[PDB]
Design a protein around this ligand. Structure first.
Ligand SMILES: O=C(NCCOP(=O)(O)O)c1ccc(OC(F)(F)F)cc1
Ligand SMILES: O=C(NCCOP(=O)(O)O)c1ccc(OC(F)(F)F)cc1
Ligand SMILES: O=C(NCCOP(=O)(O)O)c1ccc(OC(F)(F)F)cc1
Ligand SMILES: *Cc1c(COP(=O)(O)O)cnc(C)c1O
Ligand SMILES: [Cl-]
Ligand SMILES: [Cl-]
Ligand SMILES: [Cl-]
Ligand code: NA
Lengths: 394, 257
């Protein structure tokens, strides 16, 4: 029994071992209560404003769109404390942890970004934080590991399986199954078992709410489309949620195309994988023909979650949202374009959303269109990756 | 078929508990795995629980995670596991054979087709580790349509609602987790006419088998302890079988009246 629907159409659910169901039920109850509690809302609003720096700007990009009929705004989640949108929801989940009487946080991280977000929220709220991270990722992500340790988090290298993101997810869940009386599992995207896709959306929805108010103020209308990259689905659902009932507003999700869909070296399960059951949910997966879970590939490690949030699979199935892909080279060109023409260094994740907007503009330059790209994070972290690729290609 | 029902009736007539080893199919290779399984049976296993290697075995601890990795290193696939299952059943007509599966492997090519394949090879039960009772309907339905018992975990803190659901939905046996007093859970499951309880998780010694039976369970399942013997003796296949035989013999002896 649950308080809320765990499915979005056919997608979603609570596919966890029996022992974890009480943890999910407790979390769902606490969330439902919190959402009705003005004190919880006020505390969350206070953190978002005074600690994280909300609202974030909505920046018009005249230089990029000159000579076309595209007007392009960027929602500046890159200016949020921590440099990406992840901060919004980790602050909300940390407050849920405290609401449930918990003093400890467990989190997973791939290349370290959610680990850092989890550690910063834990440090502020006085929670003891432990982060599981694949040994392969630890070795390659010294800066993020160091950030987590500076913020007082325990970083636990995971040597099991293939020692990457999905293995870190596995170890975090195993821990939580034993420790959930005292520890909250701070899941890093709008995916996994109910109630996480719901909670993460609601703790990211201020992205779209602010964007709506800002675009009404500046343009006097709603956008023609809002465009967001999709790794697991959190920044995209946060931008999309408040516009779902505005049927004129396009919702465009951009998965990583990697080296190209036809190569199979991509991270686009929603449009190019196959529905499976894993990570506690029924959703499109990267998987072998016989059902072993595989990896996503992208130039951007942040887009490597090998599935996708169930609400995106649902919005796609009903035709409310449209999902596309952008390759490594397309993302790289968008990264360079924003740096040179607007003086903003975008995350390579966010560069995928920008790249799709640039195509929308360039393919039909006389089409009048008002577009918002969710600029989910800043790209200082990516300058070594970008340097290395540009130098190798001469 | 009626393999669990016949087994428990026979054990009851002998005032005896069941001893049920778990191994991963194809660990450390197909050939050796088939020999391991014959050894477990020859040493006195009353039933088997058999895992199909899966990329992401969330519900498994380190010993079995390592078993999965060994099976993958040997190139073991679900298709090969089903070939193994048919061969095992052909050799051993009455021993109940249960699988421990992950949902994706059941769902992958269709839930109904999965259970039909289990029926074709002569499997008796399937426990899907990451399907809680709440999500179990299509799995239980497909299982029973194909003469397969769906097995559920009963956690030791299970509330009354969960006990009633497990009692109604499960067949073959109830998997009673080691980690309320177990004897009380065992009594409630009996009151609710549940499938006979097998205690599992952390069963590594003869005294734990006897304790399970004394508490009123129908028997005990042991995995990590069996698999550790495989891991310890990888370099010596013959010694591996000798030690498996000794261990299973001791564990089975602990179940006898
Ligand atoms: O995508 C996920 N995490 C994102 C981590 O973010 P980053 O540090 O940037 O890789 C993620 C983690 C867990 C999950 O479900 C479950 F818990 F069941 F495994 C689903 C998605
Ligand atoms: O302790 C556990 N396993 C011991 C029995 O399995 P195995 O060690 O493979 O025989 C165990 C740990 C966690 C768990 O739930 C979840 F997967 F969600 F984390 C279920 C079982
Ligand atoms: O039977 C199992 N393992 C062997 C017995 O445990 P151990 O002797 O500790 O290895 C076993 C049963 C169920 C399971 O997943 C879940 F609990 F979620 F259903 C994982 C392992
Ligand atoms: C983590 C991250 C993403 C991808 O995660 P989603 O849950 O799909 O939003 C995208 N952009 C940035 C900057 C990120 O840090
Ligand atoms: Cl309003
Ligand atoms: Cl150059
Ligand atoms: Cl019932
Ligand atoms: Na993805």
């Amino acid at each position: 029994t649950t308080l809320l629907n765990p499915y979005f159409g056919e997608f979603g659910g609570m596919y966890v071992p029996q022992i974890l169901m009480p943890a999910l039920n407790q979390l769902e109850e606490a969330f439902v209560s919190a959402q009705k509690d003005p004190e919880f809302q006020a505390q969350f609003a206070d953190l978002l404003k005074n600690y994280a720096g909300r609202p974030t700007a909505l920046t018009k990009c005249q230089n990029i769109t000159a000579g076309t009929r595209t007007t392009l705004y960027l929602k500046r989640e890159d200016l949020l404390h921590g440099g990406a949108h992840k901060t919004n929801q980790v602050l909300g989940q940390a407050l849920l942890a405290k609401r449930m009487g918990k003093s400890e946080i467990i989190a997973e991280t791939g290349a370290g970004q959610h680990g850092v977000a989890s550690a910063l929220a834990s440090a502020l709220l006085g929670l003891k934080c432990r982060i599981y991270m694949g040994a392969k990722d630890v070795e390659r992500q010294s800066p993020n590991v160091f950030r987590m340790r500076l913020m007082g988090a325990e970083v636990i290298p995971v040597h099991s399986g293939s020692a990457t993101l999905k293995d870190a997810c596995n170890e975090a869940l195993r821990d939580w199954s034993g420790s959930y009386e005292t520890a909250h599992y701070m899941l890093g995207t709008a995916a996994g078992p109910h109630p996480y896709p719901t909670i993460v959306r609601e703790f990211q929805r201020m992205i779209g709410e602010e964007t709506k108010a800002q675009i009404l103020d500046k343009e006097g209308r709603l956008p023609d489309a809002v465009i967001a990259c999709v790794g697991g689905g959190s920044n995209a659902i946060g931008m999309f949620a408040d516009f779902i009932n505005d049927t004129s507003v396009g919702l465009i999700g951009v998965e990583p195309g990697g080296h190209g869909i036809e190569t199979g070296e991509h991270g686009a399960p929603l449009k190019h994988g196959r529905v499976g059951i894993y990570f506690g949910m029924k959703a499109p997966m990267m998987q072998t023909a016989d059902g072993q879970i595989e990896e996503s590939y992208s130039i951007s490690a942040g887009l490597d979650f090998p599935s996708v949030g169930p609400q995106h699979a649902y919005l796609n199935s009903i035709g409310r949202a449209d999902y596309v892909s952008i390759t490594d080279d397309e993302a790289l060109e968008a990264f360079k374009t924003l740096c040179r023409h607007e003086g903003i260094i975008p995350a390579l994740e966010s560069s995928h959303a920008l790249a799709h907007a640039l195509k929308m503009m360039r393919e039909q330059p006389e089409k009048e269109q008002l577009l918002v790209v969710n600029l989910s994070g800043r790209g200082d972290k990516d300058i070594f990756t970008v340097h290395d690729i540009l130098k190798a290609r001469g | 078929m009626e393999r669990y029902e016949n087994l428990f009736a026979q054990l009851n007539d002998r005032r005896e508990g069941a001893f049920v080893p778990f191994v991963t199919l194809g660990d450390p290779g197909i050939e050796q795995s088939l020999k391991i399984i014959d050894t477990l049976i020859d040493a006195g296993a009353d039933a088997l629980e058999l895992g199909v290697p899966f990329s992401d075995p969330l519900a498994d601890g380190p010993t079995i995670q390592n078993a999965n990795l060994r099976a993958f290193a040997a190139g073991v696939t679900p298709a090969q596991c089903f070939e193994m299952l048919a061969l095992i059943r052909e050799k051993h007509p009455t021993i109940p054979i249960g699988l421990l599966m992950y949902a994706n492997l059941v769902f992958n090519n269709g839930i109904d087709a999965f259970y039909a394949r289990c029926e074709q090879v002569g499997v008796d039960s399937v426990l899907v580790a990451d399907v809680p009772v709440e999500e179990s309907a299509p799995f239980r339905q497909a299982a029973l349509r194909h003469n397969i018992a769906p097995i559920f975990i009963c956690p030791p803190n299970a509330d009354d609602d969960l006990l009633r659901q497990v009692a109604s939905y499960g067949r073959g046996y109830t998997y009673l987790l080691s980690r309320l007093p177990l004897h009380h859970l065992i009594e409630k499951l009996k009151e609710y006419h549940a499938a006979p309880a097998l205690q599992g998780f952390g069963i590594s010694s003869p005294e734990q088998v006897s304790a399970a039976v004394r508490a009123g369970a129908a028997g005990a399942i042991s995995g990590s302890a069996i698999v550790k013997i495989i891991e310890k003796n990888l370099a010596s296949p013959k010694q591996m079988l000798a030690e498996l035989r000794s261990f299973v013999s001791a564990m089975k002896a602990a179940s006898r009246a």
